[PDB]
Amino acid sequence: VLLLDVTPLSLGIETMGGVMTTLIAKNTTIPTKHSQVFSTAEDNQSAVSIHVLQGERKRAADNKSLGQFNLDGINPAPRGMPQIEVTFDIDADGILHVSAKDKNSGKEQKITIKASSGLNEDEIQKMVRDAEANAEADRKFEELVQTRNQGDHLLHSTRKQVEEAGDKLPADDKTAIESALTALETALKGEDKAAIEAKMQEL
Amino acid sequence: VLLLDVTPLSLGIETMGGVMTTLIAKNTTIPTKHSQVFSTAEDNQSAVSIHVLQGERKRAADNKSLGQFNLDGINPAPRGMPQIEVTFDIDADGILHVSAKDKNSGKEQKITIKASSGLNEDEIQKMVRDAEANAEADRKFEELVQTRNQGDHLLHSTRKQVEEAGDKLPADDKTAIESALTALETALKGEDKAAIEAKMQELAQVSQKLM
Amino acid sequence: RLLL
Amino acid sequence: RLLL
Question: Positions modified as N6-succinyllysine (chain B)?
Answer without folding.
Answer: 114, 140, 199
